[PDB]
Design an enzyme around this catalytic site. Structure first.
Site, PDB file in Angstrom:
ATOM      1  N   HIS A 194      43.211  28.154  54.709  1.00  0.00           N
ATOM      2  CA  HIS A 194      43.456  29.435  54.056  1.00  0.00           C
ATOM      3  C   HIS A 194      44.148  30.383  54.993  1.00  0.00           C
ATOM      4  CE1 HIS A 194      40.793  28.287  50.750  1.00  0.00           C
ATOM      5  NE2 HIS A 194      39.932  27.874  51.664  1.00  0.00           N
ATOM      6  N   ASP A 206      47.766  37.315  53.195  1.00  0.00           N
ATOM      7  CA  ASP A 206      48.954  38.125  53.112  1.00  0.00           C
ATOM      8  C   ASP A 206      48.521  39.489  52.578  1.00  0.00           C
ATOM      9  OD1 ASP A 206      51.285  39.484  51.974  1.00  0.00           O
ATOM     10  OD2 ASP A 206      52.160  37.589  51.305  1.00  0.00           O
ATOM     11  N   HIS A 244      49.961  42.882  51.201  1.00  0.00           N
ATOM     12  CA  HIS A 244      51.166  43.604  50.755  1.00  0.00           C
ATOM     13  C   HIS A 244      51.334  44.992  51.409  1.00  0.00           C
ATOM     14  CE1 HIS A 244      51.741  41.322  46.676  1.00  0.00           C
ATOM     15  NE2 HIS A 244      51.753  40.520  47.719  1.00  0.00           N
ATOM     16  N   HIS A 248      46.267  38.636  49.256  1.00  0.00           N
ATOM     17  CA  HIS A 248      45.951  37.326  48.725  1.00  0.00           C
ATOM     18  C   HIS A 248      46.213  36.244  49.753  1.00  0.00           C
ATOM     19  CE1 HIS A 248      50.182  36.206  48.030  1.00  0.00           C
ATOM     20  NE2 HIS A 248      50.356  37.460  47.671  1.00  0.00           N
ATOM     21  N   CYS A 249      45.593  35.111  49.496  1.00  0.00           N
ATOM     22  CA  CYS A 249      45.836  33.880  50.237  1.00  0.00           C
ATOM     23  C   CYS A 249      47.223  33.357  49.888  1.00  0.00           C
ATOM     24  CB  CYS A 249      44.738  32.875  49.905  1.00  0.00           C
ATOM     25  SG  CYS A 249      44.783  31.435  50.969  1.00  0.00           S
ATOM     26  N   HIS A 298      45.932  28.693  45.194  1.00  0.00           N
ATOM     27  CA  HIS A 298      44.916  29.538  45.831  1.00  0.00           C
ATOM     28  C   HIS A 298      44.734  30.887  45.135  1.00  0.00           C
ATOM     29  CE1 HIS A 298      44.009  27.365  49.769  1.00  0.00           C
ATOM     30  NE2 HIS A 298      44.724  26.539  49.013  1.00  0.00           N
ATOM     31  N   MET A 353      41.610  33.865  44.964  1.00  0.00           N
ATOM     32  CA  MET A 353      41.689  34.290  46.359  1.00  0.00           C
ATOM     33  C   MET A 353      42.641  35.471  46.523  1.00  0.00           C
ATOM     34  SD  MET A 353      41.261  31.596  49.372  1.00  0.00           S
ATOM     35  CE  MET A 353      40.786  32.389  50.893  1.00  0.00           C
ATOM     36  N   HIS A 366      44.055  49.913  29.596  1.00  0.00           N
ATOM     37  CA  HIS A 366      43.851  50.936  28.605  1.00  0.00           C
ATOM     38  C   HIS A 366      42.357  51.232  28.562  1.00  0.00           C
ATOM     39  CE1 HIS A 366      44.719  53.163  24.849  1.00  0.00           C
ATOM     40  NE2 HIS A 366      43.463  52.875  24.594  1.00  0.00           N
ATOM     41  N   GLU A 375      48.442  56.434  27.740  1.00  0.00           N
ATOM     42  CA  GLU A 375      47.520  55.674  26.874  1.00  0.00           C
ATOM     43  C   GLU A 375      47.277  54.303  27.517  1.00  0.00           C
ATOM     44  OE1 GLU A 375      49.174  54.636  22.825  1.00  0.00           O
ATOM     45  OE2 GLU A 375      51.115  55.223  23.663  1.00  0.00           O
ATOM     46  N   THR A 376      48.360  53.684  27.949  1.00  0.00           N
ATOM     47  CA  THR A 376      48.406  52.337  28.478  1.00  0.00           C
ATOM     48  C   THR A 376      49.480  52.331  29.567  1.00  0.00           C
ATOM     49  OG1 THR A 376      47.743  51.491  26.308  1.00  0.00           O
ATOM     50  CG2 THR A 376      48.775  49.927  27.860  1.00  0.00           C
ATOM     51  N   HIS A 388      45.594  45.653  27.359  1.00  0.00           N
ATOM     52  CA  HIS A 388      45.941  45.902  25.984  1.00  0.00           C
ATOM     53  C   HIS A 388      46.947  44.922  25.372  1.00  0.00           C
ATOM     54  CE1 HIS A 388      46.085  48.074  22.184  1.00  0.00           C
ATOM     55  NE2 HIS A 388      45.173  48.918  22.619  1.00  0.00           N
TER      56      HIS A 388
END
Ligand SMILES: [Cu+2]
Ligand SMILES: [Cu+2]
Ligand SMILES: [Cu+2]
Ligand SMILES: [Cu+2]
Ligand SMILES: [Cu+2]
Ligand SMILES: [Cu+2]
EC number: 1.7.2.1
Lengths: 333, 333, 333
Positions: free
Chosen positions: B88, B91, B93, B128-129, B138, B143, B248, B272-273, B299
């Site tokens: 494993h 990363d 971001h 994430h992996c 993964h 993960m 939502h 709303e969304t 939604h």
């Protein structure tokens, strides 16, 4: 105190048209009264004659566009006639509390209810049916529409100057999931109780069989094409209650776009294509500069041209050769 | 010189809760120390008892939310115990260089590593992996998590005024792709090496079998519903490491939303969304105005109500009839 | 009067490179002349040797990036040689009228045409083929590209200050729908007329078999990796004519992003991942701060790593340990 407020009754019209309203409010806050009658009905949705059991507000897919101003009260009388078979309700994304009204509006066949809510936030918003345990089946059978809550002083551009539309249209886009047998033909159904498990299986594919504007393939074409004239300012409200879409006016632009539909935000300018997320209404403003036929599509072009998400504008007026011209017409070499 | 900076050890908590932190920084920049232990474990993800071999940071899907301030250093000790079977890595971001740390954190079972990075950009970010050749397997086995990098002076609205939350929750949404046989039942697997080709085939359909909040259908319901009170200001951080989602709050709104999660941008108002693209974390701020149960959903309502992407808020307090009321309760005609 | 304007002939280059241009306009408005030749050709799109009959502008997928300034005129000579078999045309999303030029540019094999349009709106825009009745088949066979219309005074940040790029690349992302037999192997085809119904069926699944950058799996890797140096400012233009994508620079960010590609709007800052809707071009600006290999992907990681939507940057220069460092390298416990 709400009993001291003016009441005004609105008479709704069928999409893509929109009932009469004023962009800039000419009165103080009002209680705006609407009535809708739920109708379960058979609908033919494509050129092949595919027929579904649709679930509608006021007989149409989408449901009609309701128009109020910020801080008006919306009072909706919702009628479920005893000729229907299912329980229905309504969730307004414009409203605050009780699942958008869903928890307070459950009506069996033979019942009605009246809901009131204050329209506190300006924008275009989705409304849809949402009965407990059956939500996506009702929504994807056509039971959704939109409401526009205008700012009291109307629409503004990114610099806070007025934007006034000459015409408005409402385009509801609907994803349908018609069950198919193993060979790929559409199945037919007697009772929705017998339809139900196949409806669920069809939905779970996440792959709509049809995606249509105004309830059918080709609904916004021919004699039912949208119209405008060169120089006219047009607002197109577009909703999708369940699935993302990406409207595009072929041969035009969205001059001012509220992709997620909320008018306190500045509009995005000069859009070619914009993403309206599922569960959202958006709005785009365009001034036509050229006459002729325009296609208004979901710009997943497979969804547009194969599954049905395409309509037309027919625009009258004067051609502008400065903006575009054929210098040498198609010819042999 | 980093050795002159204060070090602070954070003790992580299980989602949807978030470890203790200060919105406005009460100190100068720090090295903030975190530890996570990777755990490969069986997880039951639905009501039917479907069991997958999950891959987790710290035993949960999602991984925990880490919280720092802009220009802090994040120092992560990542432990891969020899009870695991796979290689494993991680990363971030939020980080700059070496594939977000992925190239520097490859740990075999029985190994650990310590990575440090400077949190130069404020926002919520996915981690994430991402092991070479195995990335989506993964990620889609669970993960992934998120990190929030607050501005040193906390959150601001669209006019640059403070926004202070009273509560924060982290909703990780996970798409799973459980392999199915030709009849449509889920397959079971001994060794992930034997699972691998069927996992790839399932992923290549681009059609998740389950989409869940906090690791399972119904995880954020009942006794594990999110809570708030009328008048409380709640920040909901939502991540999706692989696939678009559209949150939502049914019966509410996103008052201030950073849909793509980066706090140097003004928030979108009154949503709303909103669309959180796959590989992104977003954040929404809402002040509750009505008591009762709210559903928080993706939604695409099929994804919500059939595939699992729905949770609940339970809100205590006082009902406001001005905002919404039943004028005539459902009754016969 | 257009005949009084300077004419300038552009010689196009193959993506991901971009022809020579000036960010800030050094002249007044011009007629900028382009020529493209349509080429129907076989293309191998993956490591397995899958071969499709591609439809291209200028021999490449995507078509080349055209670059002009706001209020220039674009004059395109479009040639369809008699070695092709199909009718083609071109729709510019940058243009106003006649279906973006589509209605005026229908060329049979052995024909050419010359279209002129005024570039009134600044931004990156998609262009694509759109022959009546065949639109998605042409687009999803590779017949799309993009055009960049720069503001006359170049790009600006969110505060109106200049942003100047040192390098520019064009990444066209293409969804292909290669027909499969019941067992799942790709089918081959003699005449596109015989291919046509299977092409439609494959498209209607809404599930691409391949999603690639620059026309093939691995096209932007190895010797064809994108390059930069630490400290260089890079603009990446990315288009998707049919389907949503969500670019992400693994180990970096989008410092300034116009996700829907229109330069009159302020950029979004510090993006991890951004959504480019299908039918849109977007642009992201990044200053590299760390050397090494970066992966540029669609952050649906299945689409990236299984279906092909991944490329590499190779960045030279000096490693910055303040931004990131391995404190304790992977080792046993
Ligand atoms: Cu209903
Ligand atoms: Cu809803
Ligand atoms: Cu892993
Ligand atoms: Cu990533
Ligand atoms: Cu063509
Ligand atoms: Cu187009």
């Amino acid at each position: 105190d709400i009993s001291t407020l003016p009441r005004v009754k609105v008479d709704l019209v069928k999409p893509p048209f929109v009932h009469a309203h004023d962009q800039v409010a000419k009165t103080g806050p009002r209680v705006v009264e609407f009535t809708m009658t739920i109708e379960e009905k058979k609908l033919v949705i494509d050129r092949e004659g595919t027929e579904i059991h649709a679930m509608t507000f006021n007989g149409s897919v989408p449901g009609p566009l309701m128009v109020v101003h910020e801080n008006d009260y919306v009072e909706l009388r919702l009628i479920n006639p005893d000729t229907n078979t299912l329980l229905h309700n309504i969730d307004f994304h414009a409203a605050t509390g009780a699942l958008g009204g869903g928890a307070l509006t459950q009506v069996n066949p033979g019942e009605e209810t009246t809901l009131r809510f204050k329209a506190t936030k300006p924008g275009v918003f989705v409304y849809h049916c949402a009965p407990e345990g059956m939500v996506p089946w009702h929504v994807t059978s056509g039971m959704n529409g939109a409401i526009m809550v205008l700012p009291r002083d109307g629409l503004k551009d990114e610099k806070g100057q007025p934007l006034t539309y000459d015409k408005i249209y409402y385009v509801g886009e609907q994803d349908f999931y018609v069950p198919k047998d193993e060979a790929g033909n559409y199945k037919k159904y007697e009772t929705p109780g017998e339809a139900y498990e196949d409806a669920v299986k069809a939905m779970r594919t996440l792959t709509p069989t049809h995606i249509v504007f105004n309830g059918a393939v080709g609904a916004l074409t021919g004699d039912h094409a949208l119209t405008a004239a060169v120089g006219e300012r047009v607002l197109v409200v577009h909703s999708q209650a369940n699935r993302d879409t990406r409207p595009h006016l072929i041969g035009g632009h969205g001059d001012y776009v509220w992709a997620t539909g909320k008018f306190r935000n500045p509009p995005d300018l000069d859009q070619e294509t914009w993403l309206i997320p599922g569960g959202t209404a958006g709005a785009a403003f365009y001034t036509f500069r050229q006459p002729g036929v325009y296609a208004y599509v979901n710009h997943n072009l497979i969804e547009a041209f194969e599954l049905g998400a395409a309509g037309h504008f027919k625009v009258t007026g004067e051609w502008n050769d400065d903006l575009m011209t054929s210098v040498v017409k198609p010819a042999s070499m």
